[PDB]
């Protein structure tokens, strides 16, 4: 009888159940240990010197710290350009203002909101979420093509009179809303934005088109980031300070290890055609009989 490995696998049973935690002690998942695995019959050696654990903890520290050192770089850039201009900032966002108004207290509230936002930074925030489309698959040719289409010459009448017809006035902006009447900070916020054609400033609405109405509230402050990594930090009254976010003091494979945007493969219920309207999810559920 050439008896199968499956029956001796089951009848050999499982030795013991051992649970384990993660490093941050957030999840706690359990591990089985079957005796009839081939894990036993390879005769593995095992050892852990402490210097390797120290280097492992340092590498894991870097992997956790890449986001917060990016946020610290953002704060340093804010303070750098705020020292650089000399304290005089323009209004880059459309809001009607009054002249007789106390403005030193708005500066105090702006410093307060800046310290509060630095206290409550997280990996689920503006710059990380705006960075995730930049790490994608077709980002290189898309940015190259947008650069070439931006840097195209003035068209001659030949391509206007016989060539093909020519051709994104709104942008997908990401926002961190902080607020000091309640010390409530709001992290993952999406804002549709474009220019006001009557002037040269920006108009910020919802995806529904709400005309986002926190800018008139005197206590909030917002951080805006654009997909081309342009930077904005807007105190009430429409005045704001601008920069570029600088990530050049950071490694590349750390940025791809941490929050590189995901690419999916084909499972059941998915179109082998690329990009049609898919049907519903597979949805293996316990409410129904599982069929």
């Amino acid at each position: 009888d050439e008896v199968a490995r499956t029956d001796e696998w089951k009848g050999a049973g499982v030795s013991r159940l051992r649970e384990v935690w993660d490093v941050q002690h957030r999840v706690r998942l359990r591990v089985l240990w079957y005796v009839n695995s081939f894990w036993r019959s390879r005769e593995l050696s095992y050892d852990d010197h402490e210097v390797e654990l120290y280097r492992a903890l340092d590498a894991y520290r870097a992997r956790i710290a890449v986001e917060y050192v990016l946020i610290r770089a953002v704060r340093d850039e804010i303070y750098a350009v705020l020292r650089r201009d000399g304290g005089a900032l323009p209004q880059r966002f459309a809001c009607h203002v009054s002249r007789n108004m106390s403005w030193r207290v708005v500066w105090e509230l702006c410093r307060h909101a800046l310290a509060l936002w630095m206290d409550w930074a997280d990996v689920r925030s503006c710059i990380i979420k705006a960075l995730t489309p930049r790490l994608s698959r077709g980002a290189a040719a898309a940015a190259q093509r947008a650069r070439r289409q931006r840097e195209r010459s003035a068209p001659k009448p030949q391509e206007l009179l016989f060539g093909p017809r020519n051709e994104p006035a709104e942008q997908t902006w990401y926002a961190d809303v902080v607020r000091c009447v309640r010390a409530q900070v709001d992290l993952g916020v999406e804002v549709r934005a474009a220019r006001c054609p009557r002037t040269g400033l920006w108009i910020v609405r919802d995806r529904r088109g709400r005309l986002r109405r926190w800018l008139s509230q005197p206590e909030v402050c917002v951080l805006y980031v654009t997909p081309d990594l342009d930077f904005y930090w807007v105190l009430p009254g429409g005045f704001a300070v601008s920069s570029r976010v600088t990530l050049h003091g950071l490694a590349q494979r750390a940025l791809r290890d941490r929050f590189q945007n995901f690419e999916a493969v084909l499972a059941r219920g998915m179109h082998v055609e690329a990009g049609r309207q898919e049907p519903e999810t597979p949805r293996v559920s316990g409410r129904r009989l599982p069929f």
């Binding site: 013991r16 999840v27 791809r256």
Partner: protein
Amino acid sequence: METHLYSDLAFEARFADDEQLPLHLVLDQEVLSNEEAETLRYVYYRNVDSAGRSTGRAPGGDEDDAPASDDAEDAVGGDRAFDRERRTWQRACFRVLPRPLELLDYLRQSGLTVTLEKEQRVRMFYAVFTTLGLRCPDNRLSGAQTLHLRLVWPDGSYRDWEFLARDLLREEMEAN
């Protein structure tokens, strides 16, 4: 249950090309919510080595150590960084049981014979049976390795849990 045997035999048959070792897991309500476990598309693991980067790259040196330098054109390297980042993950098998159960009584309701030292009758509302791989470079194995569990839902979002190799084999490697 049924995926653990198959992955055991698969890692046995694939052992000489990569010396991965099977790691049979169960996840429950302490990890992810039932709404997340009902639409869980697939899992992902990666045997990051002890001191450095990962398994899916060159051992010494690469072209990903450079700064990103804040450019628009090749914002992070280009497509080759995407290929290196996609290559380093491996897809583990996947089986989810979205009904409440007890693990030992489930395995005794299947053909297995659990002989635990004392009745640690664990109860749960939904059991997803996953099975990762962890590498040994030579036939020895360092405890300073770490894992990266990646759980993917079809919207594109994910979650990541990480834990070392030392706590995984704190007693079971010492039991052999």
